[PDB]
Amino acid sequence: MKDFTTYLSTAPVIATIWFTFTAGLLIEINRYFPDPLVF
Amino acid sequence: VRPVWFPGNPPPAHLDGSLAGDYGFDPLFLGQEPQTLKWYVQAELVHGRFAMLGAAGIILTSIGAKVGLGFPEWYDAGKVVVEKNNIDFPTLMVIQFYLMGWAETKRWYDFKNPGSQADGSFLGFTEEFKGLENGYPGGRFFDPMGLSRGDAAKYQEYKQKEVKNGRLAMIACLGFAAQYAATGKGPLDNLADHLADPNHVNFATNGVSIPI
Amino acid sequence: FIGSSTNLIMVASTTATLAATIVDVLAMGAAGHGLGVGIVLGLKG
Amino acid sequence: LPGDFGFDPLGLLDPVNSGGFIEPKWLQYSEVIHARWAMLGAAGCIAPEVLGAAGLIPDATNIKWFESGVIPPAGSYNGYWADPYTIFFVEIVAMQFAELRRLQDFRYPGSMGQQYFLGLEAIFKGSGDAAYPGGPFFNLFNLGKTEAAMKELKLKEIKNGRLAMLAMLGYGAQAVMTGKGPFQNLVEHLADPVNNNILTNF
Amino acid sequence: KVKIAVDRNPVETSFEKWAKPGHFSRTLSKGPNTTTWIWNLHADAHDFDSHTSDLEEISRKVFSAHFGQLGIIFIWLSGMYFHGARFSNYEAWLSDPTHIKPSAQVVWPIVGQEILNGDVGGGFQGIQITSGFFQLWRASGITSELQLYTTAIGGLVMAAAMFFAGWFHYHKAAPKLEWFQNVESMLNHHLGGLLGLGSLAWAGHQIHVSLPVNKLLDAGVDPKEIPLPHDLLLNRAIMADLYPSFAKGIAPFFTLNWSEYSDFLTFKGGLNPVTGGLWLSDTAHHHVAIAVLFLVAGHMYRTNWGIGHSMKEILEAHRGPFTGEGHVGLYEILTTSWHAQLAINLALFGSLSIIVAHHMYAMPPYPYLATDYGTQLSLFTHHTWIGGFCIVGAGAHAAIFMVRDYDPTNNYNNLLDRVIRHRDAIISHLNWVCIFLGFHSFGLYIHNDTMSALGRPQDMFSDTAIQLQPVFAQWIQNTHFLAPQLTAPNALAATSLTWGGDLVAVGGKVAMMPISLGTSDFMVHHIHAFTIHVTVLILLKGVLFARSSRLIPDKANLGFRFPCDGPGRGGTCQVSAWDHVFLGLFWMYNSLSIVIFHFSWKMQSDVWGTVTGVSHITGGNFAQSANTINGWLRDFLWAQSSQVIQSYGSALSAYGLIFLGAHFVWAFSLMFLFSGRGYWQELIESIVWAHNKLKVAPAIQPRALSITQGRAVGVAHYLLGGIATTWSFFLARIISVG
Numbered sequence A: 001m002k003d004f005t006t007y008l009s010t011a012p013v014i015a016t017i018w019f020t021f022t023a024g025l026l027i028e029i030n031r032y033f034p035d036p037l038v039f
Numbered sequence B: 001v002r003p004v005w006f007p008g009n010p011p012p013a014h015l016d017g018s019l020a021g022d023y024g025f026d027p028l029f030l031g032q033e034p035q036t037l038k039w040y041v042q043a044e045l046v047h048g049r050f051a052m053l054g055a056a057g058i059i060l061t062s063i064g065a066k067v068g069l070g071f072p073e074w075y076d077a078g079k080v081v082v083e084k085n086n087i088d089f090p091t092l093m094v095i096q097f098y099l100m101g102w103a104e105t106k107r108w109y110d111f112k113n114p115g116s117q118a119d120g121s122f123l124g125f126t127e128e129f130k131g132l133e134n135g136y137p138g139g140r141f142f143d144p145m146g147l148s149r150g151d152a153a154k155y156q157e158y159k160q161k162e163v164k165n166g167r168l169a170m171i172a173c174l175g176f177a178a179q180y181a182a183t184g185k186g187p188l189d190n191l192a193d194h195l196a197d198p199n200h201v202n203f204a205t206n207g208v209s210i211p212i
Numbered sequence C: 001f002i003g004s005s006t007n008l009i010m011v012a013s014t015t016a017t018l019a020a021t022i023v024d025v026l027a028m029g030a031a032g033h034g035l036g037v038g039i040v041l042g043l044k045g
Numbered sequence D: 001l002p003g004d005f006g007f008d009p010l011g012l013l014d015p016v017n018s019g020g021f022i023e024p025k026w027l028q029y030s031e032v033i034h035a036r037w038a039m040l041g042a043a044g045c046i047a048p049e050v051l052g053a054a055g056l057i058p059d060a061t062n063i064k065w066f067e068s069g070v071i072p073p074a075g076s077y078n079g080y081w082a083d084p085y086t087i088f089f090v091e092i093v094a095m096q097f098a099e100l101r102r103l104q105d106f107r108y109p110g111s112m113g114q115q116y117f118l119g120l121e122a123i124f125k126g127s128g129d130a131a132y133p134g135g136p137f138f139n140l141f142n143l144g145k146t147e148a149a150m151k152e153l154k155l156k157e158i159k160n161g162r163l164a165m166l167a168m169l170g171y172g173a174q175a176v177m178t179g180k181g182p183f184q185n186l187v188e189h190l191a192d193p194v195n196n197n198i199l200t201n202f
Numbered sequence E: 001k002v003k004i005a006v007d008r009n010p011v012e013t014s015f016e017k018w019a020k021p022g023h024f025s026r027t028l029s030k031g032p033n034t035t036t037w038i039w040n041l042h043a044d045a046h047d048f049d050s051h052t053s054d055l056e057e058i059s060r061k062v063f064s065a066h067f068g069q070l071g072i073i074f075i076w077l078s079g080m081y082f083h084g085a086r087f088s089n090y091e092a093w094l095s096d097p098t099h100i101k102p103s104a105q106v107v108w109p110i111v112g113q114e115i116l117n118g119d120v121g122g123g124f125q126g127i128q129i130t131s132g133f134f135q136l137w138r139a140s141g142i143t144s145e146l147q148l149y150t151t152a153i154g155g156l157v158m159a160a161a162m163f164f165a166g167w168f169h170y171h172k173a174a175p176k177l178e179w180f181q182n183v184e185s186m187l188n189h190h191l192g193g194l195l196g197l198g199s200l201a202w203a204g205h206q207i208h209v210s211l212p213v214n215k216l217l218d219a220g221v222d223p224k225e226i227p228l229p230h231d232l233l234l235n236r237a238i239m240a241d242l243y244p245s246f247a248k249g250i251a252p253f254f255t256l257n258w259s260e261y262s263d264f265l266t267f268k269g270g271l272n273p274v275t276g277g278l279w280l281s282d283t284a285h286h287h288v289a290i291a292v293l294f295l296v297a298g299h300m301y302r303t304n305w306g307i308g309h310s311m312k313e314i315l316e317a318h319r320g321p322f323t324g325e326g327h328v329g330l331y332e333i334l335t336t337s338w339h340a341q342l343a344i345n346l347a348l349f350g351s352l353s354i355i356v357a358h359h360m361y362a363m364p365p366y367p368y369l370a371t372d373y374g375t376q377l378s379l380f381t382h383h384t385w386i387g388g389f390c391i392v393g394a395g396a397h398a399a400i401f402m403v404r405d406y407d408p409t410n411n412y413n414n415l416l417d418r419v420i421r422h423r424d425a426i427i428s429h430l431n432w433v434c435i436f437l438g439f440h441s442f443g444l445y446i447h448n449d450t451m452s453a454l455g456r457p458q459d460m461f462s463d464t465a466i467q468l469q470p471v472f473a474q475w476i477q478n479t480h481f482l483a484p485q486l487t488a489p490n491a492l493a494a495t496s497l498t499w500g501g502d503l504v505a506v507g508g509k510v511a512m513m514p515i516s517l518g519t520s521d522f523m524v525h526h527i528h529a530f531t532i533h534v535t536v537l538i539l540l541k542g543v544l545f546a547r548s549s550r551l552i553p554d555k556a557n558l559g560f561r562f563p564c565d566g567p568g569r570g571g572t573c574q575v576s577a578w579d580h581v582f583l584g585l586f587w588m589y590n591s592l593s594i595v596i597f598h599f600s601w602k603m604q605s606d607v608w609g610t611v612t613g614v615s616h617i618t619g620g621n622f623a624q625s626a627n628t629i630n631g632w633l634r635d636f637l638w639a640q641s642s643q644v645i646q647s648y649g650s651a652l653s654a655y656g657l658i659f660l661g662a663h664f665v666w667a668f669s670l671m672f673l674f675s676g677r678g679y680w681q682e683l684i685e686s687i688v689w690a691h692n693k694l695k696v697a698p699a700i701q702p703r704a705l706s707i708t709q710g711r712a713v714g715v716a717h718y719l720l721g722g723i724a725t726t727w728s729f730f731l732a733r734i735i736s737v738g
Ligand code: CLA
Pocket: D018, D019, D020, D021, D022, E004, E005, E006, E161, E162, E164, E165, E168, E169, E173, E175
């Protein structure tokens, strides 16, 4: 389990999780606030 | 020696038997680290205690709903309380966040620093917010009748009873949720239907649980 | 069907390949059935 | 060792470089498990037809074995105390307990006589062998108290079992092809041995 | 002695080596110091030969890898069936195949991408799919979404079984080397069990499920009203109602009176006229014949009993005066070298995929496929590309064998040796014939361009000026069309409409008509011959000179993949066989792009179109326009790019976006192909200085990509760009004019 957490701490897995979080956050913001251009 | 969840297999090395409810049940090895196992012990106790309190609420309100007292069913209870009283929903939710976040955060930072909430910084209280063990906070407030400091072997027996009743109430609440999602009825109405026709009214006749 | 021309060709093919252990029985019986099915379906056309 | 007649054309009991589920210990043990389930299958697929032809059980029962509810396309029987899925969940739980404790004695020999099972622990001590536990329930009457008598009984179990396995494959084949029961096939082959064979039903 | 051989518990299942990147290589297990390490970690991840020298361990690794691939493919099939059941218009399409467009992908309503859900009919909105799954599912007799859902669950379960099989046969019970080396047994089992039992069981499903359901669908009865397949197995009276042969049962099979099975085992040929696909009775007879043929073929090699042939004995028996020892040593080569096997199997698997493309366009096997012009173009193009890639791979792994596994002290005066020993003659003759083909094939186009530009059309190579008729192909076509009358008496029609004859139309569209070959077809076929010969030249030169040349006498010691041997001796850039694969990749792209352009223009010009006479999609301009480059430039690319360039504001706008994006990626590749890593390393030095100034220089040192990685990135973005460009062009074009 320690080795599995080290594997999850490796670089492409963290890039995948972090870009999934960032893309989902932007997707959620563009859903609930549709089409923002200003402010 | 001790009874394992799966007879024949030895228990894992990180589950020894010192814990209450220690049956060696960790096939995914989620608690190999001792700090993660400590945190999961306390999460198990909190989920279990909320499930026991919730399941007792479900059962008592459903008894009072089948016997003609006018109690709602639990999937309509929150709506009818908010609408029949003078209660706005988001203010009661925010007050819940305040009180539960205060108490919960005291629990969090007593997990982090183990004797630190008994400093006197909360109003004047000392050693009444000191914990006894991991997830066992018995002082004068949380153990007022005082069963954890007399007859220690009987207190170990109560720890075993608490963990077993908590696991039973967690699967019972998962019960009530699944039973409602399948049948669309009150759970003690479902119990009345099973007592009416045991051989014919069940999950193999709901038409949802086995779709064949 | 017994005594017909297809029966005679199949029995003659199986006896010819068996006259030409369990393994030899299976192999020459498969070859005899193949040759017999070929001759039966070929003499029709 | 029981039923060792030397017949292995495809060489699967080779001890050299074995593993997985191809192994002497797995193959002999699965051979006796298939044998015992097929003896029970052969007796169970015969018995309603012969007891309805003998006039012992009524005609609401005594149906063909594939019309029992095994295959509801082949026909089902209303008159059981519940639906067949209500029956089948009890079968899931019961056979899960039985087969799963049997698996644990195969994987860990003797491990089914320590953890508390309602006082049923001396019954499941097993022996130093799979496939033949014994004990006060799996050997009720002490049959095979002599070692040679025990070998003879194991060999008779093997032979009656292999015969019943061939018979159960027979019941499946006849049931698919002619669409009737095996006792009905007995009646037709004993009535006309020439005009009721496999060569006629094509 | 053929038997099962397995080692018990070789490799423990543990997450430890997941947490140690590059554990498999002694060099890469030291850890990263520069950025090059990462790339190496992914480049050498699956090169199992460079991990261990033990052939057994390598063989086990490739076995479990193959299981992983099969599990991935099963996940993919599961996905296609599930999306076909839950997010499609398949039932509506079944009720009206001629006026509902197959769609099985829907987009969510965010950021305006909702417009991609277009009006496909059937009260549905989505992206029209061109994989041809709907036609496959109708041909298989599927009628409801429930059956597709159950197929999805089944494929997912099978994927879980494949990944368990991988884990099991690597970590728990891993086969021994002498198990892997039983190639005679492997051929017997794969020819019997795989191809044989595969086509037997499929013919079983066809005869028992496909034929009645599709016979009713062609009769016109509502799909929901059609009896479910299990009822067809259960009550043989219905089977006897549709085809009376089934009344007699399996008695004519065993009594050899097979002529009574003519109801469902036919030899009609042509296409089903109400449906535009091959007769399923012909397909059933075909799969039964194929089954019997392969089961006969699978009993050829000796295993545990005396009967059967021996591969080494058949190889060592064929020796002549011209070739010396002949095929001696080839058995030893093909039972110890995975790369040789991979070369052979890739070559034939690619060629087979190209044959699949041609035979599936020419003889449409699925119902309502020939008139789904987008599906036809997509399938042909796709399988042609896959084919070409596998051929280039064949050349690659042939060269990899030549460098790593070739050992002449077991291979001394042999077929391979003589090929190596007259390689200069081989390459020089191939060189000359490539230049000859290039000059005369391309020169006719340049000649025509010049004559057309100079106002002298009477001096061109065309059907009205100096004609160059494909007399041989026309003769073969005519012979094929006249074959049912004399040389195939039991055939009611020719095997394909393209030979000649009438015209089969479905829903007002042309399914297939006779294809005529003229001067333009002559010219494109010789262009094809030229490009294929050049690709063969590059790849074959790569494999023949992989070990040594007059330039690099010891090239073998430098490996398969290396940048060069320095600027000396005039310059030795791209001398490696890997670099020959790199150039062969570009030439393969060239060849197959002209092939799919030929197919697209020819079909739209002389085959497809509506029936009123037939009005073709491009009016029949091929015969007069496909003789000049300006003709291809104007009448094909420019003319048919209208749909893609004006796809904005509609559901096809994604094809415009991917048109532009693909152009961009193609161009982006040119930086890598045209430049070199010295410049980039120095640029990175300056940037590293800038990062050092602000205390943000990484501990893993930024390095420019290697020479070979620059070439690899280059060719990959080049291929992706070009291929995706033609993809967007094709799909937008054929969906809007289809
Ligand atoms: C397709 C490639 C492939 C190949 C070449 C092998 C080869 C092998 N397997 Mg592996 N295996 C595979 C796939 C494969 N397996 C898959 C997909 C699974 C997951 C199910 C496994 C799980 C597995 C286990 C658990 C074991 C093996 C074992 C073996 C070895 C001996 C098997 C044997 O001959 O017994 C003869 C085969 C049988 C007695 C079973 C045949 C009947 C079953 C049900 C399979 C039916 C297949 C058939 C195509 C299904 C038709 C369905 C249709 C009628 C509807 C042999 C090395 C054994 C081993 O390692 O011993 C050394 C072993 O214990 N395999």
